[PDB]
Structures are given as structure tokens and as C-alpha cells.
Amino acid sequence: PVSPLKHFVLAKKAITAIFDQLLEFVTEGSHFVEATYKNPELDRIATEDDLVEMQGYKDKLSIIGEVLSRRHMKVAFFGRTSSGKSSVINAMLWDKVLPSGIGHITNCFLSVEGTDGDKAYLMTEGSDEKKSVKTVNQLAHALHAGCLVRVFWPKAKCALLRDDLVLVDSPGTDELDSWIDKFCLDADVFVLVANSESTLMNTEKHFFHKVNERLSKPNIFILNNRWDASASEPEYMEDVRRQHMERCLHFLVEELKVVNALEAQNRIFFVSAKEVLSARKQKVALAEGFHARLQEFQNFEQIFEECISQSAVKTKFEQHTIRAKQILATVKNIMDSVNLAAEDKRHYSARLPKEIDQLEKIQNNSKLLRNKAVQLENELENFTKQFLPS
Numbered sequence: 001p002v003s004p005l006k007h008f009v010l011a012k013k014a015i016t017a018i019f020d021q022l023l024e025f026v027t028e029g030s031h032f033v034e035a036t037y038k039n040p041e042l043d044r045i046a047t048e049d050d051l052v053e054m055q056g057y058k059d060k061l062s063i064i065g066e067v068l069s070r071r072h073m074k075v076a077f078f079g080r081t082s083s084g085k086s087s088v089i090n091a092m093l094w095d096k097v098l099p100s101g102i103g104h105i106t107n108c109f110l111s112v113e114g115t116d117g118d119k120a121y122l123m124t125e126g127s128d129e130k131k132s133v134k135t136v137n138q139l140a141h142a143l144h145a146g147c148l149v150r151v152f153w154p155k156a157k158c159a160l161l162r163d164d165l166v167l168v169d170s171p172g173t174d175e176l177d178s179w180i181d182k183f184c185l186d187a188d189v190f191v192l193v194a195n196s197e198s199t200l201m202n203t204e205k206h207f208f209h210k211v212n213e214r215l216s217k218p219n220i221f222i223l224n225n226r227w228d229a230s231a232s233e234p235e236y237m238e239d240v241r242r243q244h245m246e247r248c249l250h251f252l253v254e255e256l257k258v259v260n261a262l263e264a265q266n267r268i269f270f271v272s273a274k275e276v277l278s279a280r281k282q283k284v285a286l287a288e289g290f291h292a293r294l295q296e297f298q299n300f301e302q303i304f305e306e307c308i309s310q311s312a313v314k315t316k317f318e319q320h321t322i323r324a325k326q327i328l329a330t331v332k333n334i335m336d337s338v339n340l341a342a343e344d345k346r347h348y349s350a351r352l353p354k355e356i357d358q359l360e361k362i363q364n365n366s367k368l369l370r371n372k373a374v375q376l377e378n379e380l381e382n383f384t385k386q387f388l389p390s
């Protein structure tokens with residue numbers, strides 16, 4: 001039962017390894033191009049612009065590797081006040097990481113990410129201080145288009161955080177474009193948490209219309225929470241479920257048009273975050289239907305993990321994969337140009353045996369480097385076949 005999130009972890013490892021190799025190769029290639037261009041006994045075998053191109057690639061490949069090394073999956077939770085957003089997050093983390101109450105903050109966000117340490121802490125904006133998580137409920141938020149508070153929870157205690165997932169908790173939806181710009185541009189999945197004792201509201205729909213306008217084919221899940229409230233009323237529950245399904249299906253399929261009606265079955269769930277957290281927190285007869293609701297939450301979790309791991313690998317690693325392929329194609333063109341100029345010179349105007357031998361060594365080293373580029377192209381093609389479907 002391997003978590004689907006390992007797909008993202010393995011992709012991240014693979015592409016960072018390629019970019020480590022690419023920086024090493026381009027550095028070696030740049031030294032060769034530089035030596036060839038700067039040789040006073042050679043004329044226009046390598047050009048000044050060949051060297052400028054190689055040096056420019058060299059100078060930007062380290063930051064690509066560093067950016068890749070921090071890439072992660074992000075899920076953002078939205079919904080009306082008291083719908084259960086924080087409890088859904090806590091259930092997925094197997095602990096009461098986030099508190100309840102304090103629902104008055106109208107514009108500030110909270111994220112949870114993994115720490116390699118063994119103690120939880122938080123950090124506020126523009127600060128490096130590791131503050132006790134028990135101060136979450138005391139942060140003033142006076143002046144605040146709000147702020148982000150970052151919670152760090154030991155990776156050893158939650159597999160999701162170990163596998164590079166970050167979870168974002170939001171204020172109640174009841175300028176929004178500022179929310180999208182500041183928190184949503186790199187979110188891979190959006191989760192709408194709704195009170196199943198109510199009805200899906202237009203204020204929540206409106207926010208996801210804005211997301212859908214700003215982003216292409218966003219991944220959206222709807223969790224109809226507090227489903228324990230109709231336990232022991234199975235006939236009533238059946239009818240409420242039908243009504244919720246009709247409205248949630250129409251929203252995802254007909255209004256947002258982000259899934260077809262079959263796909264939507266894997267995006268709408270009926271759960272009790274309270275029950276799930278109680279079952280998972282370490283250290284009375286269960287309500288009717290408890291195990292069925294727990295299984296439904298576990299089904300959501302599996303489908304969510306599959307969705308976010310596939311989506312984030314494409315969203316976050318494809319552009320630099322395509323860029324690496326372009327860089328390699330250009331480096332090969334430079335090696336082709338150097339080899340061709342050396343061979344032309346050898347056959348057109350080279351005279352002394354020592355000059356001929358010098359040109360032949362330039363040819364040989366340019367081919368060694370070109371073959372290295374081809375091998376890295378093969379690694380990127382393998383990465384594309386494994387991790388980047390059309």
C-alpha cells in the first residue's frame with residue numbers, strides 16, 4: 001500500500017539529479033568552449049558568442065536546481081465558517097495540529113508543512129523565530145490581503161508531510177482575487193469543505209468560479225462534512241445525499257465544467273472529520289455507519305493523493321524539463337559548430353602536422369561532450385516517459 005505521494009517524491013529526486021548532472025556537464029562544456037575560443041593559434045573555431053551562451057547557461061543552472069529542491073505539493077482548503085476545514089486538515093494529519101475557536105480572522109491564512117525536527121513550532125511573516133504553536137490563538141493580526149502563519153509539524157508524525165505535502169487553511173469565504181494571487185497560484189488541489197446540514201452556497205461557488213477563471217482545469221474536491229449528523233437516520237441520509245450530489249455535480253460539471261459527470265463521482269464525498277480524527281488520535285458505542293464514513297474518508301484520501309501527485313509533477317517540473325532539453329539541444333549545436341569548423345579548417349587551409357593534430361583533438365573533445373549531451377537527453381526522455389504524460 002504505497003502512498004501515491006511517493007510518485008512526486010521520486011520525480012523530484014529524479015529531476016534534481018538530472019539538473020545536478022546538467023550543471024556539471026555545462027560547466028565542463030564551457031571550459032572547453034572557452035579554451036577553444038581563447039586559443040590564439042585558432043581562428044573562429046569557437047566564437048565569443050558560443051562562450052557567452054555557455055556561460056549564461058552555467059550561470060542559471062544552479063538556481064534551477066535550488067528552486068527544484070524546494071518544490072512541493074500544495075492543497076488549499078476553503079469553505080464557510082465552521083464547516084470543518086481545520087478538522088479535515090487535522091484528520092488527514094492524524095492529530096489536533098490546528099486549534100478550534102478563534103474564527104474571527106477574516107483575511108489571514110495558515111499552512112502546515114513538515115519539519116525534520118522533533119518539536120512543532122510556527123513562524124510569522126518576515127521572521128525567522130520558531131514560536132510555540134500554542135501561540136496560534138494569540139497572534140494579534142491587528143493591521144491585517146492578509147498574512148500567512150506557517151506551522152511546522154514533525155515529519156516523523158505524519159506521512160503526508162514527510163512526502164512533501166503542504167496544507168493551507170483559510171478564513172471563511174462568507175477582494176478574493178487577492179486570495180488567489182497570494183495563496184492559490186501554486187496550489188495543486190482545492191478542497192471545498194461544506195456543512196452537510198446546510199446547502200452549497202453561492203458565496204462558496206463564487207470563489208471557485210474565480211479560481212476556475214484564473215487557472216486552467218483546477219483540481220477541485222467537495223467534502224460534505226458533519227455527515228455523522230444523520231447517523232441512525234439512513235433513509236433520510238439517502239435522500240439528503242441525493243440532493244447534495246445533484247447540487248455538487250451540477251456545480252462541478254455544468255457550472256465550472258472541470259470534470260465530466262463520471263469523474264465527479266471521485267470528487268464529491270460525505271465524511272465526518274470529527275469521527276476520523278477521533279479514530280486516529282493516539283491516547284462508547286460508535287455511531288451507526290461510522291466505519292462506512294471512515295472508509296469513505298480513506299477513499300477520498302487515496303484519490304486525493306493520486307490526483308495531487310500526478311498533477312503537481314506536471315505542473316511543477318515540466319517547464320524546467322523542457323528548458324533542460326532546449327539547453328542540451330543548443331549545447332549540441334555548439335559542439336557541432338566547433339567540430340565542423342575544426343574539420344573544415346583541417347581540410348581547407350590547415351598546413352603543418354601540428355596544427356592538424358591540434359584541430360583533431362578539438363574534434364575529439366567536442367564529440368565526447370556532444371555524446372554526454374545525448375546521454376542527458378536520454379535521461380530527460382526517460383523522465384518524460386515516466387513522469388510527464390500528455
Ligand SMILES: Nc1nc2c(ncn2[C@@H]2O[C@H](COP(=O)(O)OP(=O)(O)OP(=O)(O)O)[C@@H](O)[C@H]2O)c(=O)[nH]1
Pocket residue numbers: 079080081082083084085086087088099100101102103104171172225226227228229271272273274275
Ligand atoms: N458533528 C461534527 N462536528 C464537526 C465535524 N467537523 C468539525 N466539527 C465541529 O464543528 C466545529 C467547527 O470545527 P472546525 O474544524 O474548527 O471548522 P472550521 O471551518 O475550521 O471553523 P472556523 O475556522 O472557525 O471557521 C468544531 O466544534 C468541531 O468539533 C464533524 O464532522 N461532525
Ligand SMILES: [Mg+2]
Pocket residue numbers: 085086087169
Ligand atoms: Mg478553522
Ligand SMILES: [Zn+2]
Pocket residue numbers: 107108109141144146147148
Ligand atoms: Zn494576519
